[PDB]
Structures are given as C-alpha cells and as structure tokens.
Amino acid sequence: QYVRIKNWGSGEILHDTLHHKATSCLGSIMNPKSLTRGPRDKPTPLEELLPHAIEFINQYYGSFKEAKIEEHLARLEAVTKEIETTGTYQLTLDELIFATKMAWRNAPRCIGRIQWSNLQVFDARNCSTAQEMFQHICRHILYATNNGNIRSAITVFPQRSDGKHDFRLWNSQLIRYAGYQMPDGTIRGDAATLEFTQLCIDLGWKPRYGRFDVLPLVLQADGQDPEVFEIPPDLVLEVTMEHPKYEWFQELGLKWYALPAVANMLLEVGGLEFPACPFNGWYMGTEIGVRDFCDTQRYNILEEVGRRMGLETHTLASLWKDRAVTEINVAVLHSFQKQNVTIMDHHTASESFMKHMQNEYRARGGCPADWIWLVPPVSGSITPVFHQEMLNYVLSPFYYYQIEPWKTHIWQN
Amino acid sequence: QYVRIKNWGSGEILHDTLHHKATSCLGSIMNPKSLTRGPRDKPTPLEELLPHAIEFINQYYGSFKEAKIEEHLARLEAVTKEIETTGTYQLTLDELIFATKMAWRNAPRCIGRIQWSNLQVFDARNCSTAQEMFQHICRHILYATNNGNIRSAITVFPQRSDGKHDFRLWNSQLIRYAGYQMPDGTIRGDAATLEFTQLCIDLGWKPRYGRFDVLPLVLQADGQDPEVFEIPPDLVLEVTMEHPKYEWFQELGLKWYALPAVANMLLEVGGLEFPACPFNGWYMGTEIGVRDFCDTQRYNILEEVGRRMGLETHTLASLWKDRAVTEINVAVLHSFQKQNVTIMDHHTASESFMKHMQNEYRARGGCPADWIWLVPPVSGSITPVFHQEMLNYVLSPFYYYQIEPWKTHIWQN
Numbered sequence: 001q002y003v004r005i006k007n008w009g010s011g012e013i014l015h016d017t018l019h020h021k022a023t024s025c026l027g028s029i030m031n032p033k034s035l036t037r038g039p040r041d042k043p044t045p046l047e048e049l050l051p052h053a054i055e056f057i058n059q060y061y062g063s064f065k066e067a068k069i070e071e072h073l074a075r076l077e078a079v080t081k082e083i084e085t086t087g088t089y090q091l092t093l094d095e096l097i098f099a100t101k102m103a104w105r106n107a108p109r110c111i112g113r114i115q116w117s118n119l120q121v122f123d124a125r126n127c128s129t130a131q132e133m134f135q136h137i138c139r140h141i142l143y144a145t146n147n148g149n150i151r152s153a154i155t156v157f158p159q160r161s162d163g164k165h166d167f168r169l170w171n172s173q174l175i176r177y178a179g180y181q182m183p184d185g186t187i188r189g190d191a192a193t194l195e196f197t198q199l200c201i202d203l204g205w206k207p208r209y210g211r212f213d214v215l216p217l218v219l220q221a222d223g224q225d226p227e228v229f230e231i232p233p234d235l236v237l238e239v240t241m242e243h244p245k246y247e248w249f250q251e252l253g254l255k256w257y258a259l260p261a262v263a264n265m266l267l268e269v270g271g272l273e274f275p276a277c278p279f280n281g282w283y284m285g286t287e288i289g290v291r292d293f294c295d296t297q298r299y300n301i302l303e304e305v306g307r308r309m310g311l312e313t314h315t316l317a318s319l320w321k322d323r324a325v326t327e328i329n330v331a332v333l334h335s336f337q338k339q340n341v342t343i344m345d346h347h348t349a350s351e352s353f354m355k356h357m358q359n360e361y362r363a364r365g366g367c368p369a370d371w372i373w374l375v376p377p378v379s380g381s382i383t384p385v386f387h388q389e390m391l392n393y394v395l396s397p398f399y400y401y402q403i404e405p406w407k408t409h410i411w412q413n
Numbered sequence: 414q415y416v417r418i419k420n421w422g423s424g425e426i427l428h429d430t431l432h433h434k435a436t437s438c439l440g441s442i443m444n445p446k447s448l449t450r451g452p453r454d455k456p457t458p459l460e461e462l463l464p465h466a467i468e469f470i471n472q473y474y475g476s477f478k479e480a481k482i483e484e485h486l487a488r489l490e491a492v493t494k495e496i497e498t499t500g501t502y503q504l505t506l507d508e509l510i511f512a513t514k515m516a517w518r519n520a521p522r523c524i525g526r527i528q529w530s531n532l533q534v535f536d537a538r539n540c541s542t543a544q545e546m547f548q549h550i551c552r553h554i555l556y557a558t559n560n561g562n563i564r565s566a567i568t569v570f571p572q573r574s575d576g577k578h579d580f581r582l583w584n585s586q587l588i589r590y591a592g593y594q595m596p597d598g599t600i601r602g603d604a605a606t607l608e609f610t611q612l613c614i615d616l617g618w619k620p621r622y623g624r625f626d627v628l629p630l631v632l633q634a635d636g637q638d639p640e641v642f643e644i645p646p647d648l649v650l651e652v653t654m655e656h657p658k659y660e661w662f663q664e665l666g667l668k669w670y671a672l673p674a675v676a677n678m679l680l681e682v683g684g685l686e687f688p689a690c691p692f693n694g695w696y697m698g699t700e701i702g703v704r705d706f707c708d709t710q711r712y713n714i715l716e717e718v719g720r721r722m723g724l725e726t727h728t729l730a731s732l733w734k735d736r737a738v739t740e741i742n743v744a745v746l747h748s749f750q751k752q753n754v755t756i757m758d759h760h761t762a763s764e765s766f767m768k769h770m771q772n773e774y775r776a777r778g779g780c781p782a783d784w785i786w787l788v789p790p791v792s793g794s795i796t797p798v799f800h801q802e803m804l805n806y807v808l809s810p811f812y813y814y815q816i817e818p819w820k821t822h823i824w825q826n
C-alpha cells in the first residue's frame with residue numbers, strides 16, 4: 001500500500017505511495033550502476049521502447065488540469081505509428097519541456113527542486129556540428145548568467161539514435177577551473193580536474209598554469225571526434241572573495257564562478273535517451289565555501305584560513321576547523337550578495353526543500369530523496385532536512401550519470 | 414567476490430569481502446524492522462538454534478592466534494549435547510566477553526569502535542529479581558563513571574528462555590533527564606522523554622518538575638512486572654556548562670550527565686538472545702552540544718544562545734546558527750575537560766574511526782558502517798568520515814533494537 005515516513009523534528013508522518021512507480025542500492029556509494037546509463041551500439045529494441053513511450057505519453061496528458069482526451073488518444077496513435085515507421089520518435093516541444101522539469105523533479109540528490117517548474121528550455125535537437133554545440137552552449141551560459149541574476153536553464157541536444165552518433169560534452173560542468181600537476185610535486189588549481197585537464201592539453205589546449213584557469217569546452221557531435229573550444233571570458237562571470245570583517249581575506253586572492261551547470265548527465269524520458277543536455281541552477285553557499293574551498297582534494301584553504309584567524313590549528317579539540325569553515329562560508333555568501341550574484345545559504349535551502357517535499361507528498365504522495373546528498377556538508381542536524389526520513393527511488397523521466405566518454409570513445413584520427 | 418569501496422578524500426580503495434557473512438534496507442529510516450529483534454512466546458526452535466550455535470563456537474575458537482583444535486571439537490560436542498538435553502545453552506564467560514566485543518565491533522552506527530577490545534563485562538546471568546538488577550546496574554554505573562575517568566562496560570542479564578520470562582530495562586539510557594508537560598502548554602526538561610516520564614509517574618514516581626530531573630530505573634525481571642528504583646544521586650556524575658570566554662554562559666544553568674549508557678538493546682549471539690544488557694562508553698562532544706542541546710525536539714537552546722551572542726537571529730543567511738552551535742560545542746568540550754570528565758571531540762573521533770575501519774579491512778576485509786549515523790551532526794565534510802564510502806550490513810553477534818516493552822507487556826496486577 002504505502003510506506004510510513006517520519007520527520008523526527010516536527011513529528012509529522014507521511015505516506016509514500018509513489019515509490020511503487022520505481023524501476024530496476026548500496027550505502028554511500030557515489031557512482032552506483034543503478035544511477036548510470038551507459039553507451040549502446042544498437043538502437044533501442046521496439047518491444048521496450050513502445051511501452052515506455054506509451055507510458056510517458058499517458059503521464060504528459062495526465063498532467064493537464066482540464067483533460068484533453070481527444071488529443072491524448074491521437075498522440076498515442078501518432079506516436080505508435082512514428083515508432084513503427086521510423087524506429088523511434090520525436091517529442092513535441094511541450095512534451096520535452098514537461099520531461100526536463102519532471103526529471104529535475106525526480107532528482108533525489110537535488111535540494112533546490114522547489115524551483116522544478118521554473119526552468120528555461122533550449123531546443124537544440126536540430127544541432128549537428130561541434131561548432132553549433134559551442135554556439136548553443138554560449139547562448140545558454142549567457143542566458144543563465146543574466147548578469148548575476150541567475151536563471152535555471154537546460155539545452156537539449158539531439159537524442160541518441162543508434163548509439164554510434166552520440167552528442168556528448170566531455171566536461172563535468174560547463175564552467176570549471178583547471179588543475180595542473182606542478183613541477184615540484186604540488187598541485188595547483190582545482191585538483192579534481194587533474195585528469196580532464198591533461199586531456200584538454202593532449203587536444204592542444206593552452207595551459208595557462210594558474211589557480212583559476214577556466215577549462216575549455218570539449219564537445220563531441222553526432223558521434224564524431226571531440227573538438228576543443230575556449231569559453232569567451234566575457235561570458236564567465238566570477239565572484240571575488242571578501243570577508244565582511246577580515247580585510248586580510250581578499251589577500252587570499254580567492255574567487256569562484258557564479259554558474260553551477262551540470263554538463264555530463266543523460267536525460268531519460270519515454271524510452272528516449274539524451275546523452276547531452278547541460279542544465280544549470282544557482283549555487284548554494286556550502287557548495288563553494290565548504291566543498292570547493294575546504295575539501296582536502298580540492299582547494300584545501302582550511303589550514304591557511306586557520307592561521308590567519310589566530311586559532312590553535314594544531315589542537316583539533318579547539319574546534320578551529322568549525323570556526324574557520326563558518327567564516328569562509330560567511331565570505332562566500334557575503335561576496336556573492338555584494339556583487340549582486342544570486343546565491344542561497346544552506347539553511348534557507350533546507351527549509352525550502354522541506355516545503356517542497358511536503359508539497360510533493362500532497363500533489364503525488366512521494367518525493368525521491370537521497371538523504372546523504374540532501375543534508376548540507378556542515379551543520380547537518382541544525383537543518384530540518386537531517387531529521388526527515390526519506391525514501392530514495394529512481395522514477396522516470398530521470399537524469400542519469402554516464403560513463404566518462406574518453407573511456408568508451410573509439411577515436412578516428 | 415568483493416565489493417570495491419573508495420575514500421574520495423585520500424583516494425584509497427578497499428575490497429569488502431566481509432559482507433558475504435550478512436543475514437536477512439530503506440534510506441534514512443531510523444527504526445527499520447531489519448534492525449529490530451522483537452518478543453517471543455515460545456522457545457527458539459532447535460533446527461535454527463543448533464546451526465547458529467555451532468557457527469558461533471567456530472568463530473570463537475577461530476579467533477585464537479594459537480589454535481586449540483582439541484578444545485574446539487570438545488566445546489562443539491558439549492554444546493550440542495547441552496542443547497539436546499536442555500533445549501538451549503549457556504556461554505562460557507570467556508565466550509560471552511568475546512560476544513559483547515564482537516557485537517560492538519559489528520555496530521554499524523558506532524563511531525568509537527576503535528575501542529572494541531577495551532570493554533569490561535559484568536556477568537549478571539544468575540540474576541533473578543528486580544532489586545538484584547538494580548544492584549548490578551548501580552555497580553555498573555559506579556564502575557563506568559570512575560570519578561570522571563569513564564570506562565566502557567556492559568552488564569549481561571539472563572538470556573531469553575521461552576520469551577515469557579524476559580529481563581528488560583524500560584529506560585532508553587541508564588541516566589536520562591525527565592520531560593514534563595507543563596501546565597501552560599510549554600514542555601520542560603528533555604522533551605524526548607515525555608511519554609516515558611509519564612509512565613514513571615503512573616508507577617508512583619515523584620515528579621520533581623525541573624529541567625534536569627534524573628529519571629528512575631524501571632526494571633523488569635524474569636518476565637515479572639516492572640519495579641521502579643531511583644538512582645542514588647551520589648552515583649549520577651554531571652558536568653556544569655561553562656564557556657571559556659562568555660561568562661554569561663553558566664547563567665544559562667546548563668548541565669549534562671557524563672555517562673552515555675544504552676539500556677534498551679538486545680544482544681544476539683549464537684542463536685541466543687539477551688533482552689537486557691546495558692552498555693556504556695564515553696561521550697563525543699556533538700552528542701550533547703549539538704543533538705541534546707540544539708535539537709528543536711530536545712532542549713532547543715539555539716535561539717537563546719543566539720541573542721546573548723549578539724547575532725542577527727532573524728536573518729538565516731547571517732549564519733548565526735552555525736556560529737552559535739560551535740560555541741555551545743566549545744562549551745561542552747571545555748566544561749568536560751575542566752571538570753576532568755572523559756570526552757572526545759567529533760573531529761578526533763572521526764579520524765579515530767578511519768583508523769579503525771582501515772584496521773578492520775586488513776584484519777578481516779570489512780567493517781559494517783552506517784554512513785548516516787557515522788557522520789557527525791555538524792561539519793560533515795570537514796571530517797574524513799564524510800568522504801568515505803561504506804557498506805552497511807548486519808553481521809553476528811549483533812546489538813539489535815527492541816520493541817518498547819510497555820507496548821507488548823501483559824500486566825499482572
């Protein structure tokens with residue numbers, strides 16, 4: 001029937017009846033196969049496609065407040081015919097829009113899903129060349145950045161056909177800093193982008209060897225070899241880090257890009273796959289201040305910000321790490337607010353999600369949620385999300401992870 | 414074969430081959446049935462008991478560095494005979510000790526398992542009356558408290574026989590503060606102990622209506638009705654809260670008990686069940702400072718500590734909550750350190766667990782771990798535990814949860 005869910009904070013109880021629509025689970029594994037949709041070298045078998053397709057069409061037409069039965073049956077038949085004759089099918093623009101928001105809505109790891117309906121969709125399904133991808137991406141970056149007043153958007157490239165003509169962005173995020181392996185063993189820049197940075201170099205990119213060198217777009221169109229394009233600097237909006245009290249903060253010369261755009265995920269809908277569909281939202285403080293700046297495997301500025309604060313950086317029990325990270329976080333939020341760039345603190349975000357989750361259970365009795373990802377990287381139990389029991393299931397439409405392209409790509413030249 | 418585990422912090426990889434020994438899973442559910450071992454009204458069937466028993470005996474004798482084959486086969490036969498003739502079996506003191514440490518070792522939610530071998534065991538298997546339980550408990554509390562130099566210990570009461578003669582402590586923890594539903598709608602004390610507090614009252618306990626009134630021990634022996642006993646005040650060691658800078662802190666009149674003792678869990682071993690086996694360790698800062706003091710459903714002192722600090726307690730984005738909780742945490746650790754009471758900060762604890770987990774994979778290729786419980790309630794990603802992928806599985810021996818006794822107890826008088 002349903003699964004009982006309790007929020008140990010307010011005490012409220014919820015009944016999940018939505019998980020029954022799940023498809024095909026191991027603790028805290030970051031990249032489980034169940035969340036990945038790999039490559040193919042043959043079209044999607046009709047016996048599988050037709051059912052998913054029909055299923056989707058029913059959902060779309062089942063969303064309207066004022067039912068349009070006639071159109072529904074019509075679309076169903078037309079869709080079927082199209083599959084029989086073509087061996088696949090094209091979604092209507094209206095359907096695609098509905099698909100992107102649903103997939104976002106069904107993203108267990110996203111904390112900003114309250115915005116699920118506010119999303120701009122760029123139809124780049126008629127694209128065909130790398131240069132054309134690059135243009136669409138730039139238009140996206142420019143639209144999303146909106147001079148600091150960030151707007152959520154997604155650019156949908158041509159769906160996978162046979163599997164040998166896949167449109168793919170080799171980057172993890174559109175805007176991302178480079179990571180260089182310095183001469184003297186030490187790393188410089190974003191250590192997380194080490195391997196990919198090398199690739200960019202192997203493809204003739206000019207390594208400017210700096211702390212914040214924006215990586216080039218490595219695009220792949222219609223199954224062809226990837227072409228490298230440098231993002232126009234005028235497009236990449238950044239925020240300089242300043243602390244509202246510690247004037248020595250800016251002396252650290254820190255900064256981060258204001259555009260959080262996922263680039264390497266696949267959009268699944270009605271049996272159709274979209275290997276390239278970069279999407280963006282706006283940042284949440286802790287992402288930059290806690291993960292990007294404080295993770296040891298990233299910029300690791302924690303021990304440095306410690307000394308400058310005059311803390312006992314050699315006595316763990318002094319809770320110096322807790323004190324520091326909070327000021328680094330204050331910096332991020334402050335710097336963004338000052339420079340008029342959209343951003344949301346984790347606390348405000350958490351409440352927002354609770355409101356969303358609550359709205360979801362009413363509207364459809366459920367909300368797929370990965371607790372491990374939803375609870376912020378600092379002050380967990382301080383946020384309401386921590387005390388909320390959640391069920392994590394894969395619905396459809398969905399945004400899947402993909403196998404890194406450079407591992408499965410069969411080179412031409 | 415094995416399951417690959419990655420620590421995104423250091424990059425290290427681990428191979429889990431221990432999960433194969435698991436027994437009979439839903440996101441962030443706090444009390445899943447898979448973790449609970451309920452009541453019985455009939456003995457444990459021999460067909461099930463004998464295999465588990467044999468299995469356990471093999472483990473125990475399989476731990477010795479210098480194998481004692483003779484004794485092993487002997488114990489096996491003697492154990493079997495004892496089961497055939499008695500319909501159950503008694504563990505040797507040495508075996509019980511081994512069982513308690515293994516069960517602790519196999520506690521997915523415990524972060525202090527590095528201490529798994531340092532545990533004192535009190536054999537109270539020959540107990541028979543409530544008053545006798547009360548005496549054993551006091552001896553435990555006194556031994557564990559050790560004038561602030563906390564010692565880990567466990568008192569094992571008589572194992573379940575038929576199921577109608579169960580030894581049970583109705584308390585969640587040995588030392589626990591009372592929670593009263595005040596006249597003017599407001600709660601007072603520990604809101605979490607509301608329902609149980611009432612029960613104590615229903616049994617004639619004298620409600621002193623205060624913020625920190627230590628609850629009475631509600632003991633149940635040999636399946637009989639529960640008898641109430643008040644813990645001798647001289648036994649309950651407490652710490653007064655003081656901040657190393659804010660002299661106004663002690664003006665809050667806060668304090669907490671120095672003894673973290675689980676009282677209502679069941680010990681499973683070789684097919685045997687121990688419905689009453691209270692155990693204790695020493696506190697970890699965040700337990701008190703973050704959960705006990707800051708949770709809205711507990712003492713909720715966050716908004717209060719905020720004002721006194723002169724923070725913008727009405728502007729979430731100001732990160733006042735983050736600033737406060739850290740000072741409340743500083744207080745706890747400080748107050749404990751000053752008053753010479755054993756305690757460990759979460760950071761030091763996290764590293765400790767990493768060392769343990771690492772030692773476990775070498776010693777036996779695995780370590781059952783509930784990430785959701787292991788990662789501290791504040792500064793998650795700041796601790797190494799956050800970046801460590803973990804597998805959560807139920808081994809044996811194990812410490813299970815039990816159904817609250819007052820719900821399944823058939824009263825006499």
Ligand code: HEM
Nearest residue numbers: 104107109110111112115152154279280281282283284399
């Ligand atoms: C509008 C503001 C938004 C905020 C504040 C937000 C925030 C977040 C955060 C904090 C994460 C975790 C990132 C990490 O730790 O790596 C995340 C993940 C994610 N977001 Fe949202 N998000 C927003 C919009 C969007 C949009 C518009 C979509 C899709 C159309 C979306 C899809 C996802 C997905 C699929 C993930 C998971 C990425 C992964 O698994 O690595 N988000 N988001």
Ligand code: HEM
Nearest residue numbers: 517520522523524525528565567692693694695696697812
């Ligand atoms: C010696 C120091 C120890 C420390 C610092 C420690 C710390 C912790 C912490 C932080 C928790 C989570 C508590 C909560 O959030 O409710 C916990 C849970 C637990 N601990 Fe340990 N522990 C220690 C010793 C022990 C011992 C000696 C045993 C058993 C013999 C043990 C068994 C467990 C179990 C089974 C849980 C889970 C309780 C539950 O599920 O509610 N711990 N411990």
Ligand SMILES: C[C@H](O)[C@H](O)[C@@H]1CNc2nc(N)[nH]c(=O)c2N1
Nearest residue numbers: 386387388389441442443785786
């Ligand atoms: C819903 C969620 O499981 C719950 O609120 C949590 C999560 N992790 C926890 N972590 C610990 N150590 N103790 C807890 O009480 C909880 N509770």
Ligand SMILES: C[C@H](O)[C@H](O)[C@@H]1CNc2nc(N)[nH]c(=O)c2N1
Nearest residue numbers: 028029030372373799800801802
């Ligand atoms: C191992 C663990 O899953 C991993 O380190 C985590 C946990 N939760 C997370 N939470 C978010 N939002 N993003 C992350 O990168 C991670 N990674």
Ligand SMILES: Cc1ccnc(N)c1
Nearest residue numbers: 260280281282283284
């Ligand atoms: C899409 C997306 C991913 C990560 N963080 C965000 N804020 C948004």
Ligand SMILES: Cc1ccnc(N)c1
Nearest residue numbers: 673693694695696697
């Ligand atoms: C046994 C136990 C339980 C909870 N916290 C601790 N520190 C110890």
